[PDB]
Symmetry: C6
């Protein structure tokens, strides 16, 4: 399903970074949502067109998208994805 | 499950390029990418439909790492391809 | 399921070669069929006893057999496998 | 599916350490390990609940290689955490 | 499910060793049982508290625990795990 | 799902050898391979039945990379083994 982490720890960020591509990693709330891969890139492209949030895949098919940004924005994004 | 990205970002293209073979990467600059169709297919279908697309002008195809096929090209062509694949 | 590629592109061959063992790769229609592994080797052994087609596993359990040869032969093989 | 190991062996700790990131390994000596809670979670839940635990005193969390979260700490804390996760 | 190998061959031991961690490998009947990972470590910890049997994961989620020891002990352990 | 290859090709043997451990590879020349039985088994069954076969004369066993066991030997022996495994 979907989940939002408000005010994540440094340790939480470290865990996520280990599970992201170097390109993304090198670049607050975090929204985590499980999506099939077409949806994943569709919704990530959305965010790249949107300021104020950053996106990345999380590894582990149906995979995980992580949305990093400000509390309002992250919530807005998770809402948009539910439609 | 299928999805079409209209007018993809440069970052979107970068994300996809990271997830395709080095050999396929050049094919993106040889084609106008109005749209990207992403569809999850069993492997026999994948290569069947890729081959189709490779024969078609105006689109380029690549695997993305039941797996994912990406169809790059002009809006009409991408839409046509996704339609054909639904049949 | 099963599928046959008539007159494959060079790019199509390149995609398949990336997904085959070095031994096979180093060695027109292409038949692609998804089989459990016992069936896979059973039906591939058949082809090795048969002239005019070549066989290989394709990676990605239930896996994929690829049958390379002449149009008649490939069709014949895909038919035999349906029984 | 969840499980709590009360009063784990040194060998049990060794087995788990082998299956966690090198970075997490030190966190075990910074905390009294009366108990270990092991629960299998989808990844969004995993990081959600880890983050919770990392904010909580008396427990430490780590991934073990839908995946596995390990919660290390004092009996009360571990039990509380496993309870919260059931909700 | 579960299975017990009485008086295993050297070849059987070799096959299992290939599929265990170096740490375990470096350390008769063999009980093999498929368990979810929480159960796995729970029941392995049990064995570490118990003399006369040794435990290890076998690789290949729901994974496999291997219990090495004397015939009585191995049987006792497989019984305990059924509860 | 099970299958028996009667009178396998040299190429068939080559394909299987590529997919077994280097250690197992020699065992094929120590045994007359009239037939190869291939059966997909959960891992406890795999080692249980391998061990059986390793104790039996006239067959050799190996893993092929729920996984696959290959039973190499004489037609009678292979058939007997596949039968025993159905029980």
């Amino acid at each position: 399903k979907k989940r939002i982490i408000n005010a994540p720890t440094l340790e939480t960020l470290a865990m996520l970074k280990r599970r992201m591509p170097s390109e993304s990693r090198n670049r607050d709330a975090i929204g985590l949502i499980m999506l099939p891969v077409p949806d994943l890139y569709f919704y990530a492209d959305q965010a790249s067109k949107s300021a104020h949030v950053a996106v990345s895949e999380i590894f582990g098919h149906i995979t995980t998208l992580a949305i990093f940004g400000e509390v309002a924005a992250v919530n807005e994004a998770m809402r948009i994805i539910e439609d």
